[PDB]
Structure 1
Amino acid sequence: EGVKTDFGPPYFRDLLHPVIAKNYGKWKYHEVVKPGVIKRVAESGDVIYVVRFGTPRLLSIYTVRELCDIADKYSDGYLRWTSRNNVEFFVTDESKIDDLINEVQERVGFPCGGTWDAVKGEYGLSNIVHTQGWIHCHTPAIDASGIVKAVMDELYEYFTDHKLPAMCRISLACCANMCGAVHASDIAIVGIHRTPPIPNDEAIRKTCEIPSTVAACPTGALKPDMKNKTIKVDVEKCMYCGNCYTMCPGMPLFDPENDGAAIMVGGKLSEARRMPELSKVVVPWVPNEPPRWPTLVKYVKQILEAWAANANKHERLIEWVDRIGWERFFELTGLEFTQHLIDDYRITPYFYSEFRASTQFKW
């Protein structure tokens, strides 16, 4: 017979709550009832409550099983995750919503929240999209989980309530690869190196395909050294992106004293009100200081509190800056502008700025 392969994921229709399967594509309206609770009303008249909780993304299989027991008790054995790694249950009996919230909170320690409401114009801060850091990745400049935890411990109140005037995503990339929509977040934390690689010639000879390692460098700082069958770095051209070490074990550039994070702001994915936008560096570097990263967390909070105190309803960070200008932005956030922030990544073509990176256009 042979081992089965190429069978794909289980078909989702078989894993839907009966009420959701029945009303599929036949919804009238949703209504955010309270933080963490969205009421969905079907054309049939069915009403379902989607109850959302924050998770640490990394889960013990024992947590998943506890969440299973809970979903069997309140959600008829059905549940989902969201695209920011919150977990949602489906409740038909409104009188059970609060029983579910309290049981989740007690059994697994996950908070109800992560929602927002454009109608009233009051927004929660949702989960932080982040990746592996030191838990599993060989190329990080910073940890991911430790920072997410330190940042959410500080901004927790914004997750459980709708206190912000507009949408704010915070996202974390443990190195310049991103592994996420970190490059288009209202506030982005990005691991960076500040030191060049030092070629290990032996490891390069044994393990690195040279022309492709060379072609990976965005600034052309790498050349083959044919004499010694290795690679040479022009340190004056290198900006410590890390891509040559992705390609080649013989090119490490980690310095635990000088690796840390840049803070970027003003990205936007959705089209509402204003076109999408890539985030922009406003703090060049902050060190790694585990377990709590106080310097990093201090700047993230400072930027979020300044925007939140001055933004109009619906006015996301980039929209706030559209209004006031970067001059006043730097003033109100208490941030310094330095030459580091003036873009010099030469390879990107200007013609990209003339392409429509948006679904907004007229028919």
Structure 2
Amino acid sequence: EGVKTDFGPPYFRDLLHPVIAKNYGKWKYHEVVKPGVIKRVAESGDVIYVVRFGTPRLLSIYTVRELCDIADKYSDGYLRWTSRNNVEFFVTDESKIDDLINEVQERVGFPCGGTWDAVKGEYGLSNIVHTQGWIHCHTPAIDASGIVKAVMDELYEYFTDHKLPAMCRISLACCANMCGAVHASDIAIVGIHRTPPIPNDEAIRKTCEIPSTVAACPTGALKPDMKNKTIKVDVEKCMYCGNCYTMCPGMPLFDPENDGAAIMVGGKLSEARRMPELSKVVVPWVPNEPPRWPTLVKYVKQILEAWAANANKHERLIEWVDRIGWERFFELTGLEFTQHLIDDYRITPYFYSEFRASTQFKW
């Protein structure tokens, strides 16, 4: 016998809904019925109705189980998750969708929507991809599930309806390790520190490996203290990234009062209309204000609004900016350009700007 290993996940093909399995790779066209409901028509003429709801990522197994209890009714025992942590059910009897939606929102209270129709040209706001925060992570400057909750509560009307003239991703990273799609989102909330690390000369001898810690500093702010057998931080060079704490339990830089979030903007992953683009810092620091984080939510909302109100059909935040420029951007969004926004990260090579970071080329 002995413990079985290296057997992988279960094969996906055995786990598909009958109709889905039957028309694998033989679809004819999709059609967004209303928000949160997409109709898919197969070449063989068979019809399925994909039904999307928003989850809070973090799920209790009992919630998961009630979803299963839901799937055994309306979707033949079948369901998927999306790449923004939405739950999707598969309906084949279309006179049943408006009940699935009722029952879900009454059993687990999972909103329908998080969809978009580029055909007409009216988009919903979808889920916020996020990380761990104070729930499970040891290096967060901000809490994810808390900020997500607050923002989504404010921006609820956008998720259920197709209110926006183009697609908008909001994303969250709890620190500079930027987990998720956060470095390429239309709007990104990034956890930062504003204070340098104070060496724990004690824990450094006992735990850390000094040469590799020193080696992890992007600005060369660290140097081995030979005496002494510890690390010296040159404060003039430290931009408080917190990488050194990743390597070394002896390098905390947490200051409850000065940790907070930066807000970046104008990222894009898709090829469509214009090339993919990295996010850009437009709001240097907002504080942690648990539980409701009003400073942060007000700025996020204020950026979204200013963009909704002015952008053409399809024109995404970065494309808007392409059109009006950073001058008119800053004025319209009502934000302030300060010196913090002038890039000074020396290490990234210029030649990257000359590489084709996109599948857009001619044959």
TM-score in same-fold range (> 0.5): yes
Alpha-carbon distance between aligned partners in 1 of 2:167 and 2:302, rounded to the nearest angstrom: 17
Alignment partner of 1:325: what SS?
helix
Deviations 1:300-356 (A, max 9, x none): 000000000000000000000000000000000000000000000000000000000
Alpha-carbon distance between aligned partners in 2 of 1:156 and 1:220, rounded to the nearest angstrom: 45
What is the TM-score of this pair, normalised by structure 2? 1.00
Deviations 1:132-180 (A, max 9, x none): 0000000000000000000000000000000000000000000011110
Give, in angstroms, the shift of residue 207 of structure 1: 0.7
Alpha-carbon distance between aligned partners in 1 of 2:229 and 2:144, rounded to the nearest angstrom: 37
Alignment partner of 2:103: what SS?
helix
* Count of matched residue positions in the alignment of Structure 1 and Structure 2: 363
2:285 counterpart residue number: 285
Give, in angstroms, the shift of residue 362 of structure 1: 0.4
Deviations 1:247-302 (A, max 9, x none): 00000000000000000000000000000000000000000000000000000000
Deviations 1:39-77 (A, max 9, x none): 000011110000000010000000000000000000000
2:161 counterpart residue number: 161
Give, in angstroms, the shift of residue 130 of structure 1: 0.4
Deviations 1:5-32 (A, max 9, x none): 0000000000000100000000000000
Alpha-carbon distance between aligned partners in 2 of 1:179 and 1:343, rounded to the nearest angstrom: 21
Deviations 1:79-125 (A, max 9, x none): 00000000000000000011111110100000000000000000000
Alpha-carbon distance between aligned partners in 2 of 1:208 and 1:282, rounded to the nearest angstrom: 36
Give, in angstroms, the shift of residue 226 of structure 1: 1.2
Deviations 1:186-233 (A, max 9, x none): 000000000000000110111111111011100000001111111100
Alpha-carbon distance between aligned partners in 2 of 1:279 and 1:156, rounded to the nearest angstrom: 24
Alignment partner of 1:353: what SS?
helix
Alpha-carbon distance between aligned partners in 1 of 2:341 and 2:66, rounded to the nearest angstrom: 47
2:337 counterpart residue number: 337
1:129 counterpart residue number: 129
Alpha-carbon distance between aligned partners in 2 of 1:191 and 1:175, rounded to the nearest angstrom: 4
Alpha-carbon distance between aligned partners in 2 of 1:277 and 1:204, rounded to the nearest angstrom: 40
Alpha-carbon distance between aligned partners in 1 of 2:248 and 2:34, rounded to the nearest angstrom: 51
Alpha-carbon distance between aligned partners in 1 of 2:332 and 2:257, rounded to the nearest angstrom: 30
What is the TM-score of this pair, normalised by structure 1? 1.00
Alpha-carbon distance between aligned partners in 1 of 2:239 and 2:74, rounded to the nearest angstrom: 53
Alignment partner of 2:156: what SS?
helix
Alpha-carbon distance between aligned partners in 2 of 1:207 and 1:165, rounded to the nearest angstrom: 53
1:197 counterpart residue number: 197
Alpha-carbon distance between aligned partners in 2 of 1:157 and 1:248, rounded to the nearest angstrom: 44
Alignment partner of 2:59: what SS?
strand
Alpha-carbon distance between aligned partners in 1 of 2:216 and 2:359, rounded to the nearest angstrom: 31
Alpha-carbon distance between aligned partners in 1 of 2:308 and 2:204, rounded to the nearest angstrom: 50
Alpha-carbon distance between aligned partners in 2 of 1:131 and 1:156, rounded to the nearest angstrom: 21
* 2:254 is aligned with 1:265: no
Q: CA RMSD in A?
A: 0.4
Alpha-carbon distance between aligned partners in 2 of 1:16 and 1:361, rounded to the nearest angstrom: 35
